[PDB]
Paper text:
GORK is a shaker-like potassium channel in plants that contains ankyrin (ANK) repeats. GORK, also known as guard cell outward rectifying K+ channel, is the only outward-rectifying potassium channel in guard cells. In contrast, GORK activation causes potassium efflux, reducing guard cell turgor and volume and in turn stomatal closure.
Tetrameric reconstructions of AtGORK were obtained in two conformational states at resolutions of 3.4 Å (AtGORKFL1) and 4.3 Å (AtGORKFL2), allowing de novo modeling of 662 of 820 amino acids (residues 58–720) for each protomer, while the remaining regions were not resolved due to their intrinsic flexibility. Notably, the symmetry in the TMD portion adopts a typical four-fold (C4), but reduces to a two-fold (C2) in their following cytoplasmic domains, thus leading to a deformation within the tetrameric channel. Remarkably, ANK repeats from two neighboring protomers form a stable dimer through specific interactions mediated by their protruding loops, creating a buried area of ~1,500 Å2. This reduction affects the communication and coupling between cytoplasmic domains and transmembrane helices, ultimately maintaining GORK in an autoinhibited, preactivation state. Due to the reduced symmetry within the tetramer, the C-linkers exhibits distinct conformations between adjacent protomers, either “flat” or “kinked”. Consequently, the C-linker in AtGORK deviates from C4 symmetry, and the presence of the “flat” conformation disrupts the formation of a C4 symmetrical gating ring, leading to decoupling between the transmembrane helices and the cytoplasmic domains, ultimately affecting channel gating. In contrast, the TMD of full-length AtGORKFL1 displays quasi-C4 symmetry (essentially C2 symmetry), with subtle yet distinct differences between protomers A/C and B/D at the N-terminal end of helix S5, yielding an RMSD of approximately 0.75 Å/256 superimposed Cα. Analysis using the HOLE suggests that the AtGORK adopts a closed conformation.
Residue numbers in the entry:
A (entry chain A): 58 to 397
B (entry chain D): 228 to 312
C (entry chain B): 313 to 481
The structure:
Amino acid sequence: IHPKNRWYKAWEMFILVWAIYSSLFTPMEFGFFRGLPERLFVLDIVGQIAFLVDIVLQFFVAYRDTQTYRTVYKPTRIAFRYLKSHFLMDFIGCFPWDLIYKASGKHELVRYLLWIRLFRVRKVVEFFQRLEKDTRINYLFTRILKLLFVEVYCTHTAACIFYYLATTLPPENEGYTWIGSLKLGDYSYENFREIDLWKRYTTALYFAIVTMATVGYGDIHAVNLREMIFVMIYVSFDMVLGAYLIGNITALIVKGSNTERFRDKMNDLISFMNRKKLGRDLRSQITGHVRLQYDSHYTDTVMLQDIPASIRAKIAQLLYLPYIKKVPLFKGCSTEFINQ
Amino acid sequence: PENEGYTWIGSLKLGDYSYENFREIDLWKRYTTALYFAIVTMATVGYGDIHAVNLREMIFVMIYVSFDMVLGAYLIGNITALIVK
Amino acid sequence: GSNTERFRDKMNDLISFMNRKKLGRDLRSQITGHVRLQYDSHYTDTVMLQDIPASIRAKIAQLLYLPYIKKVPLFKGCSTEFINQIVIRLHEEYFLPGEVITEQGNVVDHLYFVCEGLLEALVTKTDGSEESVTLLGPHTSFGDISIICNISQPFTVRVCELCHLLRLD
Ligand SMILES: [K+]
């Protein structure tokens, strides 16, 4: 098959949607749910079969060679390449990790294994790589968007883990956790395992989001000795993430803009013109002409001028000859004379 | 009006003043209290005396702080670029 | 940043310019190829190289370029010492298919040796100029008689294929 087939791309988009769903659901299944309920039977099953089908179909896809511009179509070699990099993790993540938990005596580590399914975020990573290659979207805005998605995914995962850390403590000694000690307004979280899923999730995500923005109100804070060590790591990592975001936005802005260039040009012009003490009507004429010059995209000529190396020939040939032969002084002249 | 507790205002006890009936206070006290909250949250200070307490306020605060984080990064970037030039 | 950013920035500006005026896909291509080349390390490579006194470079030249200059028939002087004198002062240069190298106007300045690739040799005439003078290939010379006897480089040459041409003062 060809890395750019009509529907293969349709399958890629389908699997991207499924990958987003699984990436955003696995931490929530692991944290807020000590064993998936009965109602959520078919959702897990369908997700697993979909990703297994993708595995099988990826086993039948030609790969583009890296050092060399040949896309190979050797089935044994596509086998080898797939079975090396991204087969073991995708296969292990495909096993039913809820039925195994509810069959193997309900042991905790088989549920801890659920985090293998986070490897599907590679799909979004490759999607952002493809978007970066495309010429429609600027490179640096793509980098900013990728960092904004990374921040939000890390925040959601951190919220799931932060609620999980409050379930390790025994239910009787629940007064010594970040949740179960809240008294927000009139509401008190007494038995925090008996509230709706969305209340607990929104509280945890509220804590994580006002922590990633470095607001930190302090209505919800860490209490245990395991919740302190988690917040230290989370804020230490968030600091560097935020510095990266600021740096990328700064680079995007510092690249430049047309109004900035025009204002610099007019700065030089006004300095030179006030220095030589020329007349005001000349000032108006010059500023009007330069304003038209920068409105007409005059600076494209020099940009093209910087080492195109004579492929200008057909550019000018297709761009200017429309107005050339028409003038009543070239009638009956030679073609190469017109081109030159 | 019955559940004026369990609200960001109505459960406030700044100093010796209690926002008991938060619909009869002068318009300017309510307005400048809300603005105070919004400005200490856009400056990323977050004192914590005025905080969201419901589930309709947690969502709004999350959206607002995400948007303001991006905006603050943008303002820092503009000032840095113009100083660098 | 890095060079992968300069490439993308220049190509983005070029795309803006080209699609703003609806140029056409064939030239789009010509341009793309050219842009790519300038960015690639081939160029800034030799330029930066510079500095390295020469003694050291000397060995770089005699390890890279020696067989290439030895395989040209014109240099059968049989003195490999003369040939090592030749290699010690060579500078590479890459031109894309469709590049003018030398024409009648420019006098001799360098010995343009031709590496793997085809460069078209032509001359001029008085009606459509002239076509098909000679198709230079590897292990040959190009622009030699001018330094041999007298200045001025006739036989206008516009390259037709990619080639890693050498150049000696
Ligand atoms: K703060």
